[PDB]
Structure 1
């Protein structure tokens, strides 16, 4: 408000699942897609930095393009009945029609120019 709903498609769109055993590093794709005629800068943020790694974490997705984001979980001791309270977030933003790059753009970005989307987390097995 007046916040523009997310332009990017996500897949999955609501939650990211992880298949154990969580003996080793477990990984899962998030696919982002750009259905517009402008490039869309993105950031992929996480609730537990020390626990996850995102590749790519940021970037510009060309117009009409899709990229696969690797979300990677570090090994740990599962706990079956536990609930996963990690959230993953995608911040997007059209790389301004005249943009020089994607440097200090983020800090000076308005709340209007920003498009957010949060995803839940689930463990498995």
Structure 2
């Protein structure tokens, strides 16, 4: 096994769940918590930017603190024979204690210091 976790805790940690008929937008909130004694920049990525929306898109979390990220998944024509192809990814790196620019942290960040984790999109019907 060659898979490992980022500094940020995620909730749900495994996969993003979308429950509702897909005739309209589904809203799914993801809770991200920081276990560390340091500030950390976060970013969200998705498989389709015209089918998934992420209100914050990115930010910074304080030591011991939590941020809730709302995902808005757009309506589509679901098929019971078709399989889910969609995923989410969250990227994180440590921020310095004295900056006013979050983009500069990602430009000073190295490919060996950058953390990420990945999650699938799950689809569930109301059945009522």
Same fold (TM over 0.5): yes
Q: How many angstroms apart in 2 are the aligned matches of 1:31 and 1:112?
A: 26
Provide the residue aligned with 1:65 in structure 2. 65
Cα RMSD after superposing both structures: 1.8
Q: Does 1:81 align with 2:108?
A: no
Q: How many angstroms apart in 1 are the aligned matches of 2:23 and 2:5?
A: 38
Greater shift in the superposed pair: 68-77 or 93-102: 93-102
Q: How many angstroms apart in 1 are the aligned matches of 2:113 and 2:100?
A: 17
Provide the residue aligned with 2:7 in structure 1. 7
Cα drift, residue 99 of structure 1: 4.1
Cα drift, residue 112 of structure 1: 1.6
Provide the residue aligned with 2:52 in structure 1. 52
Q: How many angstroms apart in 2 are the aligned matches of 1:49 and 1:107?
A: 23
What SS does structure 1 have at the residue aligned with 2:104?
A: coil
Q: How many angstroms apart in 2 are the aligned matches of 1:10 and 1:103?
A: 22
- For structure 2, which runs of at least 5 residues remain unmatched after alignment? none
Q: Does 1:123 align with 2:123?
A: yes
- For structure 1, which runs of at least 5 residues remain unmatched after alignment? none
Provide the residue aligned with 1:38 in structure 2. 38
Structure 1 stretches (4+) deviating beyond 2 angstroms?
Answer: 96-101
* Matched-pair contact (CA < 8 Å) for 2:93–2:106: no
Provide the residue aligned with 1:113 in structure 2. 113
